């Protein structure tokens, strides 16, 4: 996520309000904004489709091996968007390092839900609300 | 470079409502500011000649040359026309009507300097 | 620093959200320019002028001159406001034109480059040439020198350019802007209006601050060189505060 | 909530009104300078012309 | 208070009637405007900058664009009067026609809000452009520093104000005016004219009178955060006293 | 020797959508700035009646005389004529719908001085 | 007795490459600095609709009224026309392609003051 | 009152002499002054094809739209045209031979401000 100011780009400020900001190792190489889930012992990896995979938003760009920080779930957070939301839709990782509506997913449930709208590739404002892991 | 709007200069008409079989509208450029006329526009409720005449007074019209410009035949408009008279030439279009009854009579264009 | 933006509002008893200064940089790495002469010693004694001490001067000049085209080439390039005049209105009311560009996106320029082609045209215009309409005849008179024309617009400052002083990539090893400058033809650039503060020559040398100087002798071939370097770049710190008028 | 102004406006203090009372339109008053003004002796009375 | 009236035709021993001051008011509701800004410690020591008193700086300047918005929002949507130029006669005529409405309302403005668009439209009209039209060549000269700029019909303050201040609905959280600030396009609303007496801005602080900036240290998470304050309205006393222009 | 560079008129327009069956579109010079109009171009979406009036009123139509000009059938455009109407005249220009059906209708002109 | 050069008008085009075989060219007067037009030449590389519109939306184009108000057949030039829009009047031009295949439409005129 | 001569704006020519079985005068507005061009007169030695062009580019041509105007048959004169193309829309006029042979072209008209 990027922001254009004339010929500037700036980096997005991932968290808009929250303290739930929890750390862990990055077991690949993560990007600013990009949804995780636990891919070994305390270990994050980026998040595929359809659900079952996230615990968070990765707060700054790290390669593999890092250490992480996560915006857990009761935090304000801005993310790109890979098709367009409106506010009050719930949203889910893509697998494409965004988030999708849960509507558009495979999934019944989302993890966040988008308080400000957007276009797709765009940065939204999302609420971060719910965890997903292995249900089988 | 100077960049100016033209607005076109002013509209002129008269008109007549209910003028009976054998009467007529006499267009005075006397009526216009700028002194003088250019008819684009007849519009006629019936039959109508146009005749164009020139006054001996320069006041009022006391006929010197008279000419039938055309007859119009039925309702209708004439339009594109560019029919002239000025105040200072003693110029007048009389516009006659020649249905068997009352008509209304439309006439327009625009004043054009004396 | 990211434009500052505005507060939120909120609820009360409610949580104060981010939005703090974010950053980011402009880039610059200076290209060495330099510039070469030799004189044979033959020559060197004969003429009746002190050829080293000219080819001093030009290499000197070629230096400055090639700072300027930098400097040109950036400020025409990287300008991201533009007013297009589509051939007509093309004098005050086009630099105030581009002083609204500039202002729209909240920066106060202060000073305009200009062609020549641009200064023809400007004085042409009857707001500046009529002294009706200028308050002075001092561009009828005076020209380019007039007081009027570093005071228009609210700008302090005219940096009266050369036609040549751009890189069209005509010249011998210059690449080329994506530009042209001029006022001529549809998309010339004649004029740029600017932030004086907001654009950066940027000099650097190995041995000094500004140009070096180096001689060597040829005692095979009996010539003495004259060299120059200095290395340039030019750079907007924010490109928001610079228009270019188009043709 | 816990204790905030929007449910205690007209409970644990009044909303302020401003002292400075703030005025209507007010319409051109002219017609002594703009006429000729007699004061009169009578309610009823004449001018000679 | 009730505007004026007039007295009644009475006959003679009869029996005065009564009209008397009839009162209203206009309600302020102050939201609060806030902006938080947070810096990690290691951050905060590896900066060349110091990051919290240039996010301090953030916080003051976006609560002060806050205000400013507050202000410019009230005053473009609820102005009771308006000027239509209908893409013709904008610059001095349009300026005066606004003048023109708020004076048929019996109100006399002394003050006007320009938009960029306006500003330059208004300073490429022949009437300010041309120093024998204007009675002096400091528009031509010294644009928006003119004192004529502050000194046209009747008024004797300019505000010039930044595109981005109106509220068009489009910035995280603020819900949007009614109008569309401007001067562009058919219905943008450009400029303001208006008695700055009949508009308030109201200021509260719980804690003193203007923004309130305070800090917070996070132990658990290495994180330093700033936050501003201010509650701000803004209410027209007689919107009768004020007239836009639209395009 | 002083160059110029001239822009034509102030443009005028008229308009309506789904005039109903028998219903009109009345064109009145107080709508321009200028207070009168020449019309060029009507287009109309079905069969129509072009009307000239004057009013007896100086603001309302209030028939005096009144010509029908001329009747358009079918969808189409007609292009440079040059009906004109001012309002110091008291003239105006009702355009009626004939088709038996809702049609939308354009008028556009010019602004001339009054 | 003063003698003036005048410039007869300020250009506007509008133009497409290879516009679909039901795709259009819209000519929308916000496109010129005097916010109206008075487009003389159409020229057309096949079958084409001329369809004049009004907007319901200052700014964007949601149909009102709409008239097609001519249909021009193969490939080749109307010129002297006089088909008139504004912005504030909320005006725009349709040119719709009608051939089985991709057209280049070319539209000439002049700006118009608002 | 003020009164004033009106004189018209700037003349424009292209010509040329000997243009081969195949080859074209192209006709530039970028050789105008101000910046617009409005062809009234074709005068032609022989068979010709007129092409209205945009350009890709904003200083040369390089082909985006083409449409063939007309084809000319025979020695003389198209006149009263209004083919119109500017330097900031990108237009170009070109008259192409379709002679059996080399004629001569020669195309007037007058600026239009850009
Ligand atoms: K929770
Ligand atoms: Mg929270
Ligand atoms: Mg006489
Ligand atoms: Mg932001
Ligand atoms: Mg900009
Ligand atoms: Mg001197
Ligand atoms: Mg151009
Ligand atoms: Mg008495
Ligand atoms: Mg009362
Ligand atoms: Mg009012
Ligand atoms: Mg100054
Ligand atoms: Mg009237
Ligand atoms: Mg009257
Ligand atoms: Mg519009
Ligand atoms: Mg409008
Ligand atoms: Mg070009």
Redesign the interface.
């Known amino acids: 996520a990027t922001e254009t100011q004339g010929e500037h780009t700036f980096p997005v400020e991932v968290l808009i309000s929250g303290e739930e900001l929890r750390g862990y190792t990055a077991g690949e190489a993560l990007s600013a904004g990009e949804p995780v889930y636990l891919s070994g012992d305390y270990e994050v990896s980026a998040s595929s489709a359809d659900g079952g995979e996230f615990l968070g938003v990765n707060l700054y760009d790290v390669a593999s091996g890092e250490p992480v920080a996560l915006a857990g779930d009761d935090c304000e957070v801005r993310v790109e968007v890979s098709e367009q939301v409106t506010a009050n839709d719930e949203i889910l990782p893509d697998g494409l390092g965004t988030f999708e509506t849960v509507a558009t997913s495979a999934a019944s449930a989302g993890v966040a839900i988008v308080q400000e709208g957007a276009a797709s590739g765009e940065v939204c404002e999302a609420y971060i609300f719910a965890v997903q892991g292995t249900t089988a | 470079?100077?960049?100016?709007?033209?607005?076109?200069?002013?509209?002129f008409?008269a008109?007549?409502?209910?003028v009976a079989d054998t009467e007529s509208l006499l267009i005075d450029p006397q009526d216009a500011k700028f002194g003088a006329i250019e008819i684009?526009?007849i519009?006629?409720?019936g039959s109508v000649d146009v005749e164009l005449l020139t006054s001996s007074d320069d006041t009022e019209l006391v006929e010197d040359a008279a000419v039938t410009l055309d007859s119009f035949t039925g309702?209708?408009?004439s339009?594109?026309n560019q029919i002239e008279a000025s105040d200072n030439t003693n110029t007048y279009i009389r516009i006659t009507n020649t249905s068997g009854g009352a008509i209304?009579?439309?006439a327009?264009?625009?004043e054009v300097?004396q | 620093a990211s434009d500052e933006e505005f507060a939120r509002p909120t609820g009360q008893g409610a949580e104060i959200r981010d939005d703090g200064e974010t950053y980011t940089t402009v880039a610059w790495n200076a290209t060495k320019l330099t510039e070469g002469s030799r004189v044979t010693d033959e020559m060197r004694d004969q003429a009746m002028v002190d050829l080293i001490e000219r080819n001093i001067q030009r290499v000197g000049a070629s230096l400055e001159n090639g700072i300027n085209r930098v400097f040109l080439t950036e400020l025409v390039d990287n300008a991201q406001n533009n007013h297009d005049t589509a051939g007509s209105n093309q004098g005050y009311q086009a630099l105030n034109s581009a002083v609204g560009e500039v202002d729209k996106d909240d920066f106060r320029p202060d000073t305009y480059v200009t062609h020549p082609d641009y200064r023809t045209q400007l004085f042409n215009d009857t707001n500046l040439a009529y002294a009706n309409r200028a308050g002075t005849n001092e561009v009828l008179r005076n020209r380019e020198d007039a007081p009027i024309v570093g005071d228009i617009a609210g700008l302090d400052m005219h940096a009266a350019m050369s036609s040549a002083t751009y890189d069209d990539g005509t010249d011998i090893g210059w690449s080329g802007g994506s530009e042209t400058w001029g006022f001529s033809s549809d998309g010339d650039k004649g004029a740029v209006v600017y932030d004086r503060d907001n654009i950066h020559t940027i000099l650097y040398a190995p041995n000094g601050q500004d140009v070096e100087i180096k001689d060597y002798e040829d005692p095979i071939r009996d010539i003495t060189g004259v060299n120059g370097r200095l290395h340039v770049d030019c750079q907007y710190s924010q490109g928001r505060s610079s228009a270019t008028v188009q043709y | 909530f816990a204790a905030s102004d929007p449910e205690y406006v007209d409970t644990l203090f009044r909303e302020q009104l401003l002292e400075v009372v703030m005025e209507g339109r007010e319409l051109r008053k002219v017609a002594r300078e703009a006429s000729n003004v007699i004061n009169a002796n009578t309610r009823v009375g004449d001018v000679p012309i």
């Open positions: 470079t100077d960049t100016i709007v033209n607005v076109q200069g002013s509209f008409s008109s007549a409502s209910g684009h526009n519009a006629h409720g309702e209708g408009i339009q594109g209304d009579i439309i327009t264009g625009r300097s």
